[PDB]
Amino acid sequence: YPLSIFFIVVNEFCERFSYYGMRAILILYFTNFISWDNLSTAIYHTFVALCYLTPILGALIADSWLGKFKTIVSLSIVYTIGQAVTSVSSINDLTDSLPVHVVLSLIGLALIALGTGGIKPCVSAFGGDQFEEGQEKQRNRFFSIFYLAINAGSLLSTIITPMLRVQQQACYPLAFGVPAALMAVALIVFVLGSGMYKKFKPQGNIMGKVAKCIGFAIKNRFRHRSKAFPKREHWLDWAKEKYDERLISQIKMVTRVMFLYIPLPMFWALFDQQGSRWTLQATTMSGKIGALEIQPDQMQTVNAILIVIMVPIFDAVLYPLIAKCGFNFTSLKKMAVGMVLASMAFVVAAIVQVEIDKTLPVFPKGNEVQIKVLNIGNNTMNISLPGEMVTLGPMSQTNAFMTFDVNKLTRINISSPGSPVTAVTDDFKQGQRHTLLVWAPNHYQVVKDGLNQKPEKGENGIRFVNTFNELITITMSGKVYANISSYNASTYQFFPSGIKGFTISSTEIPPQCQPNFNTFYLEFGSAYTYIVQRKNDSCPEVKVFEDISANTVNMALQIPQYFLLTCGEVVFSVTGLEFSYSQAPSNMKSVLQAGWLLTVAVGNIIVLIVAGAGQFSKQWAEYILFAALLLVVCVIFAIMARFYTYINPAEIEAQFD
C-alpha cells in the first residue's frame, strides 16, 4: 500500500496549494477590471459556490465513464489550461477592442471551474480503493493524513503569496503564473505512479440504469391506488417487478446514507462566517501584542495552524483514551458532538462582541446629525447652538460629537467676546458627521467629515487644515495632498500602523524653512486632524487633534473562539468524508463523495441568503446564528441517526449476490 499512497498525498498538497493561491490574487484583479461597462462584480459571486457545483459532473463521469483514473488526468489538464490562459489574458488586457481581450479571461475562468470541481470527489475516493484487506485502521489513518495535507497547502499558501506579490501590478504574470506552475508538477507526479495504482472500470451507463429504475418505480407505484398500495419499501416493491434485485439493493444503500445530509448544510453555513463576519470584528478589536504587529486580516491563518496540530493529537492519544473507558465512539456520535462545539464557538463571540461595544463611538443615524466644533483662531469664541452654547478658546475643540435632529437644527449664532454675532447660513446633510471651523467672529467654515464608521482594515485616517494665506501641498509616504485652499480641510486618507513622515510645500513658505515633520505612533483604527500654522519666522508648525480614539481590546482574545471551532471541525469534517466512503456501494463511491461536497455548496447559500443586517446589533446575529439554527439542527440530526444509517456493512453485502 505505501507506494500507491504517497503519490496521492503529495499530489493533493500541490493541487490545493495552487487553489488557495489563486483565490487571493483573483479578487484583487477584479478591482481593476471593474472599470469597464461594474459588470465584473456580476462576473464574480459565481466562484463562491460554483466550484462546489461542478463535482456533480466529475462524479457522473468516472462512475459511469472512463473510470476514476482517467478523469483525474483529463480534468487536471483543463485545470492547468485555464490558469495559463487567465494569467496571459490579464496581461493581454492591460498590454492590449477591450472586450476581445477580456473574452480570454472568461474562457480561462470557466475552464478553471471544471478543474476545481471534477477533482475533489474523484481524488478522495481514489485513495480509499488502495486498502482491501480488512484494513479499517489503515484506511482511517489515510483520511486524516489526507485532510492534513489540504491545510499544509493552505498554510504555506498564506505565507508565500504576500512575498511573491509586488515582487516586480507588473508582478501579475508571476501572480497567476507560479500557481499554474505548481499544479503541473502535481499532474506529473500523480501520473508517474500509474504502475502502482489499483483501478476499476465501470461496466456500463449506471447513471441511466439508476434513473430508469427509479423512473419505472415511481410511475408504477402511482398505479395500484386501491390494490396493495401501502408500500413495504417506498420504491423497492415496485421496481422489483422488472429490474435486477442486486441493483435494487445498491440504490437503496445510497438513498439511506444521503437522507442524513439534509440537516447538515446548516453547519457549513456557520463555519463560513469565520472568513467574512469575524474578519470584520478583528478590525474593531485590534490592540496589538507588544512582541509583534499582526494585522486584522491575518488572524484567519490561526485556523490552519491549529488544525495541523490538533489532528495528530486526536488520532494519537485522545481517541485511544476514550475507548479505554468504554464510551465506544461511533462515526455518528462524533459528527453529533462536533456540531455542538462549533455552536459553543459562536456563543463565545457574542461575549467578546459585547465587551468591544463598551468602547466604540456613536455614529449618526437617520435624521440625526453630529457636529464637532473646532476653533482654530487666536481668540476665544462663543457659539450658539440649538438649546446650547459653547465657548472655545484658541486652538481648542469640543471633545465630543454633539448629536442633533436635522429638524431641530434651526439657528446657529457665532460671536466672540466684544465681537458682533454672525448667523450661520450654511446647510448640513443628515446622517453625516460634520466639523465646524471658526477663526474669527465673522469667519467660519463648514466641512463634511466623510468618515462615519471605523476605518477599514484598521488603517488610521489622516487629514490636514490650511491656515496659510497661500495654497499648500503635502506628501506623506506615497500619498499627496495638493492645493489645499486657505482655511479649508482636506479629505481623509488611510495608512497602516507605525510612524509616518511627511514633507510640506508651499509658495509662501521661504525655502530655508524646514518642510519635514514626523507623526507619532499611529496604532490602529484611529483618526486624527492635523493643523498647519505659521510661525513668526514663516516656518510651518504642526498641531494635532483627535477625532476617533485608537482601538483598545487586544486581538489575542480571538484565540478561544478559533480554538473551539477548529477543534469542532476536526471531529466533524474528517469523519464526515470517511464515513461517507465506508457506506457506499462498491460501484458508486464517487457518487456519495459528490453527495458530501454538495452539502457545502448549499451551505454557502444559507449565509448568502441571510445577506446583511436585519437587526439592532451583532450581539444578536452572532447568537441566533447558532442557537436558533445550529442547535435545533443538531438535535434533529441526532434523531435521524437514531434510525441506524450505520447498519450497512457495504463491503460484505455484495457477496450475498
UniProtKB/Swiss-Prot annotation:
The entry's localization annotation reads: Apical cell membrane
Impact after mutating G568V? Abolished peptide transporter activity
Q: Where is this region: Extracellular domain (ECD)?
A: 357-558
Catalytic reactions of this protein? a dipeptide(out) + H(+)(out) = a dipeptide(in) + H(+)(in); an L-amino acid tripeptide(out) + H(+)(out) = an L-amino acid tripeptide(in) + H(+)(in); L-alanyl-L-lysine(out) + H(+)(out) = L-alanyl-L-lysine(in) + H(+)(in); L-alanyl-L-proline(out) + H(+)(out) = L-alanyl-L-proline(in) + H(+)(in)
Q: Which residues form the signal peptide?
A: none
* Record's keyword annotation contains tRNA-binding: no
Superkingdom field? Eukaryota
One Pfam family from the record: PTR2
Q: What's a single GO BP term from this record? A: dipeptide import across plasma membrane
Q: Which residues cross the membrane?
A: 42-62, 71-91, 99-119, 142-162, 173-193, 251-271, 302-322, 336-356, 559-579, 594-614, 620-640
Please list the residue ranges that the record places on the Cytoplasmic side of the membrane: 63-70, 120-141, 194-250, 323-335, 580-593
Keyword entries, A-Z: Cell membrane, Glycoprotein, Membrane, Peptide transport, Protein transport, Symport, Transmembrane, Transmembrane helix, Transport
Q: Which residues lie on this side of the membrane: Extracellular?
A: 11-41, 163-172, 272-301, 357-558, 615-619
Primary localization class, coarse: membrane
What does the annotation give as the result of altering E569D? Does not affect peptide transporter activity
Tissues in which the protein is found: Expressed in small intestine.
GO MF terms held by the record: dipeptide transmembrane transporter activity; peptide:proton symporter activity; proton-dependent oligopeptide secondary active transmembrane transporter activity; tripeptide transmembrane transporter activity
Bilayer topology reads: Multi-pass membrane protein
Cross-referenced InterPro entries: MFS_trans_sf, Oligopep_transport, POT_fam, PTR2_symporter_CS
Query: Where is this chain glycosylated?
Result: N38, N378, N382, N413, N483, N488, N536
Q: What is the effect of changing E569 to K/R?
A: Abolished peptide transporter activity
Q: What does this protein do?
A: Electrogenic proton-coupled amino-acid transporter that transports oligopeptides of 2 to 4 amino acids with a preference for dipeptides. Transports neutral and monovalently charged peptides with a proton to peptide stoichiometry of 1:1 or 2:1. Primarily responsible for the absorption of dietary di- and tripeptides from the small intestinal lumen. Mediates transepithelial transport of muramyl and N-formylated bacterial dipeptides contributing to recognition of pathogenic bacteria by the mucosal immune system.
Please state what the annotation says regarding this protein's domains. The extracellular domain (ECD) region specifically binds trypsin.
Q: Which family does it belong to?
A: Belongs to the major facilitator superfamily. Proton-dependent oligopeptide transporter (POT/PTR) (TC 2.A.17) family.
How it assembles, according to the record, is: Interacts (via extracellular domain region) with trypsin.
Protein's name according to its UniProt entry:
Solute carrier family 15 member 1
Q: Which organism is it from?
A: Homo sapiens (Human)
